[PDB]
Design goal:
Pfam families: Transferrin (PF00405). Its main location: secreted. It is found in: Secreted. Keywords: Disease variant, Disulfide bond, Glycoprotein, Ion transport, Iron, Iron transport, Metal-binding, Methylation, Phosphoprotein, Repeat, Secreted, Signal, Transport. The longest helix is centred in the N-terminal third of the chain and has 15 residues. Strand 9 and strand 10 form a beta hairpin. Helix 4 crosses helix 11. Strands 5, 6, 7, 8, 9, 10 and 11 form a seven-stranded mixed β-sheet that branches. The protein is globular and about 85 Å long. By secondary structure, it is of the alpha+beta class. The chain has 23 helices and 26 strands. The protein has four domains: 178 residues, D-Maltodextrin-Binding Protein, domain 2, CATH 3.40.190; 152 residues, 3-Layer(aba) Sandwich (D-Maltodextrin-Binding Protein, domain 2), CATH 3.40.190; 162 residues, D-Maltodextrin-Binding Protein, domain 2, CATH 3.40.190.10; 157 residues, 3-Layer(aba) Sandwich (D-Maltodextrin-Binding Protein, domain 2), CATH 3.40.190. It binds ligand 8R6 (2 copies) and fe (iii) ion (FE) (2 copies). One fe (iii) ion binds next to helix 15.
């Protein structure tokens, strides 16, 4: 059977679920998904049922999505309710901290201020703010209301115990837990700020726009960011305390049945969704409100499959809630991300030589490493410019660049014999790329080549090639040299992967190689002893310049496609300051003063530079690069980038 066992937490939810079940059978062919209605006492019993393989799916709030993920349940998000409507599906809400312009403080200065909360136990209003501020709270931090009452000088915390902690109702005496209180609710908390009662209001990114219709009024307010700066209120996407998902269907991490759950719900919304006018309505019921799904929902979106819970909730939210539940308070060692066996051992004795200042975490892919940096499992790692872009869209920032001497050059290399080749028409020719998605091998070359054909389906412009990372059936995987599962894979077990592998690809079967400027010289004249390169001379190879001419290899300065942003270290903004510092020390202690090739960093790197003002993926790579990458993402297959862009379209 292709049955999805849906978990209800009430008799009304069960009744609607049974109706859901019956109407599906009139709509879905017998070879398709069906529904079964398991009923439990609570969302946690549902979570446990799903993990115990007694049910498959339930819809939860962000707090429960965290519970569902914790061991031993290990559930993940698979489908997302969206709101607003089809044009612009709203899946998340942002918890923000609104303040008045020129009030002169930031998040790390909230102690002593007057606070406005939507209500005790509420999320944007209480749980999130308090969870981020937890370790700033005075001890003892239990009971939490007492700690909060000894942190802000006075507050309006609706439904707080004003009798034992009157500070929490100074701005709304009695702490009224109803709209009878003027400072209650999302709109009430903002009023507490607007009226001058308080200095900050913990609400949602939308509260302000729903209570002030004119931009002139809104310009008198700002948001507190966690980097201890401020931004305007229409920039909440870059200045919030947490990005929270409104309503999320969860399922087993292994054992699914993600694919059926989506097929079921996708066809459910197509026949019974918003404004479908049937006897049965997926987003309402006469039996009660918000059964199975929120009544205000407009449809379902499929959660990208790379997404796990910690990634879907986000670093900030997870930090907040984790603090409230564990209650554990503390520059601490940098946890570096290693991608392979050889990289790991190099890291391991970097950790021993460091006397603790650097620990080592290992993952199997770069994107798995970035995911660990995002969610806290790891801290830093060095990345090609094409991966810092991905790391940027995912919320990370660059802390340091690799200097080898403005960075390295992206050159297109050709065999001198074949002298018909010019940059102006390589159409129908054999191409060699380091890997799809990287500066020299793809982003720059295919960036420029995107402008002159107006599309990124490059397996049709070129005849064939090796671009490790393309779908293994593509014409840009036919020249690759890996055997078995390694054919065309973007790692070492594909011989044509990397700067030099792409040049080897040119030597043995390609017509042009997109590569850095030091690659040909460093792999010719016997400098590389492996048979394929040992007897090569760099004079047999030329570079294609953009004007349309050709030029020898060692005068790349006048014959390059563009300047390439240097590789860079990336981390979370909440560790930018400490990763910079740890590393620079570890550099004049182990710098220019890898056992195989280029572990952790490229060994030709001489020092790690700081960027001053270019600590953003947009300001480090430059506008013309991100514009190019933006054009090539249309044809990109990066599952991690698909997850991060789901959170930030
Ligand atoms: C209805 C509802 C929602 C949908 C939603 O995002 N907005 C509707 C209600 C907003 C106000 C308020 C509440 O109803 O309790 N918020 C309290 C909270 O988050 O705990 C819900 C909210 O964040 O929107 C929600 O997101 O969370 C809820 C948690 C509850 N406990 C009870 C109800 C909700
Ligand atoms: C790492 C380092 C050390 C060892 C050490 O104790 N490091 C921590 C020093 C913290 C102050 C730090 C800073 O400005 O943040 N020093 C180094 C720097 O300027 O980068 C300042 C200084 O000692 O002049 C040191 O003793 O002298 C340095 C001088 C430098 N120039 C750069 C780095 C260092
Ligand atoms: Fe709420
Ligand atoms: Fe690179």
């Amino acid at each position: 059977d292709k049955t999805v066992r849906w978990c209800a937490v009430s008799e009304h939810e069960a009744t609607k679920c049974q109706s859901f079940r019956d109407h599906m059978k009139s709509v879905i062919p017998s070879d398709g998904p069906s529904v079964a209605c398991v009923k439990k006492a609570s969302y946690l019993d549902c979570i446990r049922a799903i993990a115990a393989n007694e049910a498959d799916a339930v819809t939860l709030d962000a707090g429960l999505v965290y519970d569902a993920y914790l061991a031993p349940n290990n559930l993940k998000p698979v489908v997302a309710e969206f709101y607003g409507s089809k044009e612009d599906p709203q899946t998340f809400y942002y918890a923000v901290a609104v303040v008045k312009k020129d009030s002169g403080f930031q998040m790390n200065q909230l102690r002593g201020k007057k606070s406005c909360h939507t209500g005790l136990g509420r999320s944007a209003g209480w749980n999130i703010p308090i969870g981020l501020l937890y370790c700033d709270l005075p001890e003892p931090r239990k009971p939490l209301e007492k700690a909060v009452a000894n942190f802000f000088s006075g507050s309006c915390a609706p439904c707080a115990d004003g009798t034992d902690f009157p500070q929490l109702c100074q701005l709304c005496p009695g702490c009224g837990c109803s709209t009878l209180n003027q400072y209650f609710g999302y709109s009430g908390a903002f009023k507490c700020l607007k009226d001058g009662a308080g200095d900050v209001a913990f609400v949602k990114h939308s509260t302000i726009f729903e209570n002030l219709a004119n931009k002139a009024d809104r310009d008198q307010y700002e948001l507190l960011c966690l980097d201890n700066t401020r931004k305007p209120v229409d920039e909440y996407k870059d200045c919030h305390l947490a990005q929270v998902p409104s309503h999320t269907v969860v399922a087993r991490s292994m054992g699914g049945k993600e694919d059926l759950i989506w097929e079921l719900l996708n066809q459910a919304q197509e026949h019974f969704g918003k404004d479908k006018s049937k006897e049965f309505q997926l987003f309402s019921s006469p039996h009660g409100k918000d059964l199975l799904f929120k009544d205000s929902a407009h449809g379902f979106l499929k959660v990208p499959p790379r997404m796990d819970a910690k990634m879907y909730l986000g670093y900030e939210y997870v930090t907040a809630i984790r603090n409230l539940r564990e209650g554990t308070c503390p520059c601490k060692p940098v946890k570096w991300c290693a991608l392979s066996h050889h990289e790991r051992l190099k890291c391991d004795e970097w950790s021993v030589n460091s006397v603790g200042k650097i620990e080592c975490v290992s993952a199997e892919t770069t994107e798995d490493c970035i995911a660990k940096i995002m969610n806290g499992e790891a801290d830093a790692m060095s990345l090609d410019g094409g991966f810092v872009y991905i790391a940027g869209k995912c919320g990370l920032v660059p802390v340091l660049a690799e200097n080898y001497n403005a960075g390295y050059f992206a050159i297109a290399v050709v065999k001198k014999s074949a002298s018909d080749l010019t940059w102006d028409n390589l159409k129908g020719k054999k191409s060699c790329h380091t890997a799809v998605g990287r500066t020299a091998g793809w982003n720059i070359p295919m960036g420029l080549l995107y402008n002159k054909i107006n599309h990124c389906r490059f397996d049709e412009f070129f005849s064939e090639g090796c671009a490790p990372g393309s779908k293994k059936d593509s014409s840009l995987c036919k020249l690759c040299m890996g055997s078995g599962l390694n054919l065309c894979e973007p790692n070492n077990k594909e011989g044509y992967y990397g700067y030099t592998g792409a040049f080897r690809c040119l030597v043995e079967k390609g017509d042009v190689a997109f590569v850095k400027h030091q690659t040909v010289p460093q792999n010719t004249g016997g400098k590389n002893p492996d048979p394929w390169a040992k007897n090569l001379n760099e004079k047999d190879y030329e570079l294609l310049c953009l004007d349309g001419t050709r030029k020898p290899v060692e005068e790349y300065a006048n014959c390059h496609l563009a300047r390439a942003p240097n590789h860079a270290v990336v981390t979370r903004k909440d560790k930018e300051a400490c990763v910079h510092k740890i590393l620079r020390q570890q550099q004049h202690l182990f710098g220019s003063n890898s056992e195989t090739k280029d572990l952790l960093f490229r060994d030709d790197t001489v020092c790690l530079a700081k960027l001053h003002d270019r600590n953003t993926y947009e300001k480090y790579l430059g506008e013309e690069y991100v514009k190019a990458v933006g054009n090539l993402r249309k044809c990109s297959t990066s599952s991690l980038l698909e997850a991060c862009t789901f959170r930030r379209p």
